[model samples]
Structure formats: structure tokens, C-alpha cells
Target chain A: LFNEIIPLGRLIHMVNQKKDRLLNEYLSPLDITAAQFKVLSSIRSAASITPVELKKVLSVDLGALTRMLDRLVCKGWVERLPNPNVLVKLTTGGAAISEQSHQLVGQDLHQELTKNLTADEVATLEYLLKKVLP
Target chain B: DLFNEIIPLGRLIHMVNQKKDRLLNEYLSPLDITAAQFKVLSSIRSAASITPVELKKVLSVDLGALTRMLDRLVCKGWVERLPNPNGVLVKLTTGGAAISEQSHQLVGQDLHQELTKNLTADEVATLEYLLKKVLP
Candidate 1:
């Protein structure tokens, strides 16, 4: 069976780990971990949102999510809205450079990943990944 | 921009993990392994007299958390930590290997049900091939 079908669980773990390694190396100079950077990116894209919604969209553990937010805040890349106790937005001055470099790294990773595959292959992978999700 | 439609990989993993941890914890009580522990167990089974350094690299895990996770295995009296020229090495005891072998049989049924709800037989076959092509 191991040889017959691909181990989906192992496949997911290996693929995610490769990205983790790539992001860790590429974002070496940045203050945030790759996941936190992605969180920051999501927040920036959403404009402003409550932690409730952010966690849902990001689909991460609340405790770990809070901790990454702390790191981002300490680095001045993110901040919370006081009255709401929920809303979070990127700090305009602190995050601009980090975000710019992160996109550069992300683009580089995408390039590396797809360069070996055809356009149809890329599309097929996305279709499969979407179907696999619950 | 033909390739621009690549689904965000990070978020997809997040969604895959979403709330499924509790399912593993609850189901794995019988095996004395949690979801995270099970992954390490699987890794150990894949390597022989493996060093912690190599294991960590293979799993792409942070040192501190991985140390604690492996330590739990030792505490359970299954895994062993031994001297190594390379650093600390991890090896499963006879007991540990037995559990791992048995786990190979049950781990899958414990996972994958909720994750595969809408999949047709054809799509499920197609999905694995595509993930291998792109992600591996």
C-alpha cells in the first residue's frame, strides 16, 4: 500500500516543510517567521479585521496566533485596535519594507516551484488541492 | 499570469490542520500518541539509528519543541536516546518498533475521513497524483 498510493499525509507534511524551509531562509533578515509574515500579509490584504475573523480565515490555533501577533507587534509590523480588542492592521511605517521584501521572496519561491512544471500542471495541482480540503 | 492562479499553499495547510488536532488527541488515546507524536513516530520509523539533528532537518521542526516531543517517547519507554558521533541519536526500541508497525495499520482510518468528505473516487485518485507533481 505504501508503494501503491501516495501517502497524502506525508505529501502534505513534506510540501509544507519545504515551504517552511524556503521562507525561513529567504526571510532570514526579516523579524517575523514565515507564518507570521503570511498573517501580516492576510491582515494587510483584508484592510482591517477582528482577530476572530483573522483566525478563521487563517485557520490557526488561537494561542499560537496570539503569540505570532505578539512577535509582529514587537517588531512594529502589526498593532491592535484598543477599543475593539480585536481589529488588527499592519503598521504603515514598520511593515512597508518587510512586506515588500516578503513579496519578493514569495515571488521567488513561486518561480522556483513552477519553473519545472507546465502551465497545465500548475492549474491541475491547485484543482487537486482545492478538492482535497474539507 | 496563467500560473498566477496557484492556490495559496500556506493557507491551504492551515485549513487542513484547522481544528483536526482534537480528533487526533481523542482518537489516539488508545495508542498513547497524540497527533504530533504520531508524526514523529512515523518519521523515526522511516530512519535508522537517526540523529536528532537529521531527524529535525527531515521534519523541519524547531529544536526546543522537537526535543520535548522526543523526550516524551523516551519517557513512554519506547524510544531511546544514545551517544552519537554526530550528536544525539534517536532509535526505537523493540517495543517502539512494534507499536510503529501496528500504527501503520490504524493511523490512516483515524485520519482522512473528515478531510475527504466531498471527494469522488475519481477525484481522490487525481488529487494524490497532483499533490505529488507540484508539492513534492
Candidate 2:
């Protein structure tokens, strides 16, 4: 029983690592790490969130998240708002880059995933993953 | 069709984050190792006896990345690379023994709670089953 889980765990690891490598190659011109893209993507999806919230949501250390944000901020891809101390949201540039990358990377990922499963099956897989995740 | 679908990819990502944080905090204090480092240790333990090339295959890490991690493990005195008749094998050291013991105990204590939190026993089994089908 325990032995059965190992292969699947390794498969997930391999797929994700491959995806990251591909994503890095595809988004090289954008000058962002997959980690940084994750932040921008999160903010784009949520509109606005605080650093603490981002840390919790992203499951990253505060130090690491802050450093990533600093890099994004330097590149003008994100901004820090002080009024309510919100992390603001992705800047126009950030959002644009995220959308472009999403289309490019998402298409590839979607195609890769869809190759094994039908549209309905993929939908079901997404649903099942969410049910167990949240 | 496109408008009707809003996949919860973000949720999957968040779940991973939570797991990492929980595992890291649980393991870090005792071994002074991050979750990533502990994962490497666990990978070594799982293999018990294996070469670097074999370990890389098991861990699914790039050769360069695995090499660096192995270097760190050697430097930390947790693992030793010994010359074997067939190939080099990684053997656990005194430090590794102590750390692995504590980690194993902690993981056992938390496993049920963590696994059951997001899944029923049956569902957990099912998920594991499905994942096994796709894993390399």
C-alpha cells in the first residue's frame, strides 16, 4: 500500500519540474522566475491581498515572499500600497505579463494534460483535486 | 465553454504551500533542516542503499541539483559516499541516524491527522490510487 503511493508522488514531482523548466524557457524574455510569476498570478486572480495573506496563501516564508516582492517591485511589476497596508495588486505591467504568459504557458500545459484525458475527464480531475485541496 | 470554466488551480497551489509549511515547521527545529533538506534525507532513507544516479532517479531531481544536495548532505555529516564493488553508495551517518529517527516519529504522529484532514479514508485511498496510475 505504501509502495503504491511512491510512484504517483514521483510522477507528480516530475511533471511539475518539467513544467517549471518549460515555463522558464517560454518566459525567459519576461525576466521572471516561476516563483515570481506565481505571486503575480495570485494577485491577478485575487485583485488585492496583503503580504501576510500572500505568505499564508502562497505557503512561503515571509522573508522569501518579501524578497520576491522586492524584486517584482523593483521591476515595476508590483507595488506596495500603504493606506490600508495592502500589497496593492499586480501593476498593469505585471498583469499584462501574467496574462500573456498564462496564455502561452496555459495552452501548453492544457494541451499536455488534455493529451491523456478527455475534456470531461480533465474537468473531473480538476474538481477532484480542489475537493481534496481546500 | 471557456466562460463557464474557472479551474481552481490556485487552490491546488495553496494546498501545496500549506503542506510544505506544516512539514517544514514540524521537521526543522529538530534537525536544523528545511523541508527541502529533510525531503532529500527522506529520499535517502527510502532508498536505504543506492547510488547517486539511482538516487537522482528516485528523487526526480536533475543531476546537477542532486549533486549539490548530496554535497550539502556530506558536508553536514549526515551521509557518506562510500566506494562499493559495483558503485558508490550513500551510507547514513551518526547525525543522519538521530535526525531520521526524530523525523520518522514526528511524521507518524502527524500522518493520520494530515491525510484525513482533506480526505476521507476511502477518498485518500482513491486519490492515491489515481495518482499511482499517472506517476512515473
Candidate 3:
């Protein structure tokens, strides 16, 4: 009974694992961990979100978010501005790094995915993912 | 650049991550590894052959995260990094072998439990097929 059910879940797990391993291997050279890169990316896009808002948006715990932000700050890739009203925006350097890294990460991911999909299929898949992701 | 303010993919990603982190912590606690880390190991285990570059592309993780995880695996005596003239290749070490063995058992048990509760076997297969079709 369990045997019939388990294989699909196993496949899902395997597929996810494969994607994770590939992303990590490719992004290692940028000196930006995936989590750190994600934070920077979020900051660049949102620009002036609060830390509390960031925590909610990033879906990371306060502790992990703090540590990730601390690492970025240490790298001179982020700055925390005290706004009575909002969270800190990206420092000049943070914005620059985010732009630079986004290109590198984006290109590599695109190339790899293309091997497995047609242009139309990729577009459709992205659309579907967005539909389910909210 | 048109800043077409759209749905927040970052927020969605974060939500997914939170769910992922919780699930991983719950399921992988005994192995003492994070979900991301376990993901790396399990991927390597499943591949007939994998290159670092290839692994990075497949996983959607950037090089920095991948490298650090690889470093941890190397340090733990669970994986070995061998230099190929073409590129670096990583393989399971003794500790990796032990952990992989344990992880496979535990993961299978968890999968069985989850599937039995949430979906029918036929639905599970359909889901897998659709996901594979979509997932790059």
C-alpha cells in the first residue's frame, strides 16, 4: 500500500534536491550564499521595506534573517538605515551588487533550464508557477 | 526598466522557504542537517554522475551557497572533492555513505506517511508527472 504511494513523493523530493544542488554549485563563485542573495534581491526590488516587513516577506525567522543581514552588512553589500517609518533601503553598494549578481545568477539559471525546455514551455511554466505561488 | 509592480515573488518564495525550513527541521533533525544541505546530499546520491557546474544549474542555487554546502560536506567526512581536469567532482565519503543510508530510510518513511494522508496513489503519480514536466 505504502509502496505505491511513496514513489511519487520520492520523485518530487528528488527533483527538488536536484534543483537545489545545481543552484548551489553554480552560485558558489559569487561569494553570495543563496539566502544572502535572496535578501539582497528583495531589498533591491522593494527598496524601503521594514525589517519586520522583510521578515514577513522573506519568510525567514528573525534569527536567520538577522544573521543573513549581518553577513551582507559585513560584506559591505547592505546598509541598515534608521527610518522611523520604514526599513532600510539598499546602500549604494548593495544595489550595485544585487544588479551584478542578478545578471550572473539569472543567465546561468536561464541557460540550464533552457536545456530542458522550449521557450514557450518555459514561459508557460513560469506563468503556472506564479499562479500557484501566492 | 518598467517597474511594473507585480505580485511579490520574494514574499512567495519566503513563504515557501518557511514551510521548507520547518519541514526540514522536523524531518532531518536526526541527521543534523538543514533542508538545503540535505537537498544537496540527496541530489548527489541520486545522480548517475554530476558535475559541480551541472549541479549548480540544476538546483537553481547560486555558486556561493553550493560551495559552502560542499565545504561542510567535505569537512564532515561525508563527501570528497576530487579534481578532474575538466572540473571538480564530488562523491560520497564514508560518513556521507552512512548518512545517505539513514536519510533514504527516514525520507521514504516520511514520504509514505505524508502521501497516505494527503493524496491518493494515482493523484500522487499525476502530480509527479506534471511537476516533472514543469520543473526545469
Candidate 4:
């Protein structure tokens, strides 16, 4: 068989796997999944990120994100209410801890991200190249 | 809480992983391969005599998942585990090598084109370098 360097995506998955394991290890003490922490932090930072915007941002289906949000709402980490335009926000002290959660995961990946630029941002940089198939 | 979705790096990683998996599974199934099987096969074909431990390292998969796949590959007659002086070693059978060889280029072609989607060469290289950074 012919040979070349490993496929690009394969390498990408390896990196993500490592980052995920490190994050999970740290977050287990707090009883939150990487998904819950990520969603929580995003909500803490922004004022109007309801499930609607969250679906778009998380790039996850509404069903899954909603289910996750429903769980987080139950966990007392997030709240969904008619505060305005039917918004979702982190619990009162949610922002502080969630920010720290971001920091904790950051301890593992921050350096690489700082140097490499994000995949999504890179995709947007060459936006014209990233077209969907018919 | 998962800070990754909120953090740009984590979000980007999750997105790419999901995108590749969703797309790659479809790309592989028609060829009668699971996404799991393809990478392990691809890695086997990549090197001359890569041991299971080395592959597991590169794969970052747990021992159970990797060992299970090896058993499946053996059942399919594509792989054989052999006795080694130092430790156990693995090699692909003719059928295994043939299938891996046949599918590799095609899969790589489809993967890069679709997986990269709208990514530019520079964008691709940049992301590749960054990802390689975290690989152990």
C-alpha cells in the first residue's frame, strides 16, 4: 500500500481527545460535564443566549441542547425564565464558578490555542473555502 | 460544567470532531468499515510493524476499545496477532492489507475534501499544527 503522513483529521481528533480527558478529570470534582460547564460559561458571559441562540452557538441540535439545558436548569446551575424575550441565564453565583471552569480547562489547552488560532475562526478566515455541499 | 463550548478552543474542537464523525461515518459505511475500524486500519497500513501499544498511543483510545477492534479485525481476516520475542506484535493479512490499501486513498480524498469543506491551505495547515501540539 502507498503511504504518507497521517490524515489531518486523525491528528485533530487525537488533540481533542487529550484536551477532553484533561478537562473531564478537572471537572469531575465539581460534578459537571464538559458540556454543562461550556454551556454555563457561555450563558454567564452573554445576556441573551436563550436555547435559540445556544443551539446555533453550540452547533448541537435543539433537542440535545435543550435536554442538556433542562438538566442544567434542574441542577440549579442555569435558569430559564420569562425575564425578557424568554432568556436563559446562569444561576446567581453561576458566572463566577463557570468562569473558573473555563480557566481550569484553559490550564490544559490555553497555550496551544494561543499559538494555533481556533479551527472555527480559521474556517471563517477562509470562509469562502468552507462551503456546504448540495 | 464543560467550559469548552463556551471557550472558543473547546467549541472549535467539538465542532470539528462532530463534523468529521458525522461525515466520515457515512463515507466509511458504504465501504463496509466503521470509522473506528478505518483509523486503526489506516494506522496499521501507515507503518511497517507498528505494535498495538504504539497504535493505541496514537489513537488515544483506551485499551479495551483498541483490543476489541483488534479482535474484530482478526475475525474479519484482516489482522493477525503474532508472538514476538519482546512482546506481542500485529500485522495485517493479505485481505486486511488489500482492503486498507484500497480504501485509504479514497477515504483520505473524501475526508480532506469534505472535512476541510471551505478551509484554505493555510487554514488547514494552521489547524493541523495546533492539533499536533496536543498529541502525546
Top model by TM-score, which number?
Answer: 1
lDDT per residue for candidate 2 within B14-131, as digits (tens), equals: 4543554565566566657766667678777877767889886655444555667778889999988988885688867878877877876765546446544766666656545544
DockQ of each: 0.35, 0.18, 0.19, 0.17
Q: Tell me which of candidates 1 and 2 scores higher on TM-score.
A: 1
Index of the highest-DockQ prediction: 1
After best superposition, candidate 2 residue A94: deviation in angstroms?
1.3
Docking quality tier of model 1: acceptable
TM-score per prediction, in order, is 0.70, 0.63, 0.54, 0.56
The predicted structure with the larger DockQ, 3 or 4, is 3
C-alpha-based local distance difference test score of model 4: 0.66
What lDDT tens digits, residue by residue, belong to model 2 across residues A1-134?
A: 33644422334344455555556666777676666777898888889888898877765456657767887889998988875525658889989988887776766655644465556655655555555443
Using lDDT as the measure, name the better of candidate 1 and candidate 3: 1
Q: Rank the candidates by lDDT, best first.
A: 1, 4, 2, 3
Interface root mean square deviation per prediction:
4.5, 5.4, 7.6, 7.3
Error of 3 at B30 (Å): 1.2
Tens-digit lDDT string for candidate 1 (B1-136): 2234555655565445543545555666787766667667778887867878788777664455467778779988778999888467898888888887776666667567655666777777766666666554
Q: Over the stretch B1-136, how does candidate 4's per-residue lDDT look in tens digits? A: 2322233555556656667766666776767876667778877877756788887766654455577779989999988898877777888889988888776665678888886665667767655554554453
Which digits, one per residue and each the tens of the lDDT, describe model 3 over residues A6-103? Answer: 35444445445554454556667776666667788788888777778887676444555666677777888878887863365778888877787766
Q: Total backbone clashes of model 2?
A: 0
Each predicted model: what fraction of the native A–B Cα contacts (within 8 Å) does it retain?
A: 0.39, 0.18, 0.14, 0.29
- Superposed by TM-score, candidate 3 places the C-alpha of residue B103 at a distance from the truth, in angstroms, of 0.9
lDDT of 1 at A129: 67
lDDT of 4 by residue, A7-86 (tens): 66676566567666666677876777665776786687686476888766654446556677777778877888886426
